[PDB]
Amino acid sequence: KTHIDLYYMLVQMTDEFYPQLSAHGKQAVIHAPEDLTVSGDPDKLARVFNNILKNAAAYSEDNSIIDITAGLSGDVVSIEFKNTGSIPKDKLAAIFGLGLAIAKEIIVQHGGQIYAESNDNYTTFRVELPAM
């Protein structure tokens, strides 16, 4: 009988990252309906998103935007972090203090999935969680 108000969880995280991001002229912007909700362990999910943003911040190019889009489509709530810059493909095949291994099991324990891709222009992290 619980739920996470996702937009506001993402906002709080973004605000914790603001000093680190502004120092390189970066900016995280959230695109999401504010009505959007999901089930799960709130403090565990916040750590998932924190770890991912930590990765986006580390591989994001100076003076660029980190987009965090979240939406409900069918049975899936998806949260997608996209940044300009690339993860070296050897660090990328290893990705599962930037290790997303715990993030992954948290999401997996939630019945969800994490996708990471990277070309050489931008990097995408995608979290999918079951919808209520």
Author numbering: 227 to 322, 340 to 375
Task: Show me the paper's own sentences about this structure.
VanS is a sensor histidine kinase that responds to the presence of vancomycin by autophosphorylating and subsequently transferring the phosphoryl group to the response regulator, VanR. The phosphotransfer activates VanR as a transcription factor, which initiates the expression of resistance genes. The VanS sensor kinase is organized into several structural domains, which include a periplasmic sensor domain flanked by two transmembrane helices, a membrane-proximal HAMP domain, a dimerization-and-histidine-phosphorylation (DHp) domain, and a catalytic ATP-binding (CA) domain. Here, we present X-ray crystal structures for the catalytic and ATP-binding (CA) domains of two VanS proteins, derived from vancomycin-resistant enterococci types A and C. Both proteins adopt the canonical Bergerat fold that has been observed for CA domains of other prokaryotic histidine kinases.
The structure of the VanSA CA domain was determined by the single-wavelength anomalous diffraction method, relying upon two ordered cadmium ions contributed by the crystallization buffer. The crystal asymmetric unit contains one copy of the CA domain, and the cadmium ions mediate two of the three lattice contacts that connect different VanSA molecules within the crystal. The structure was refined separately against two different data sets, one of which was measured at low energy (7 keV) and used for phasing, whereas the other was collected at an energy more typically used for protein crystallography (13.5 keV). The structures obtained from the two different data sets are essentially identical, with a few minor differences in side-chain conformers, and have an RMSD in Cα positions of 0.14 Å (0.59 Å for all nonhydrogen atoms). In particular, helix α3 occupies very different positions in the two structures, being positioned much closer to the nucleotide-binding site in VanSA than in VanSC. Notably, α3 is involved in a crystal contact in the VanSA crystals, packing against strand β5 in a neighboring molecule in the lattice. Were α3 to occupy the same position in the VanSA structure that it does in the VanSC structure, it would clash with the symmetry-related molecule. Hence, it seems likely that the ATP lids of VanSA and VanSC can adopt a range of positions, and crystallization of these two proteins has selected for two different conformers. VanSA is an exception, as its α3 helix lies closer to the nucleotide-binding site than in any of the other proteins; this likely reflects crystal packing effects.
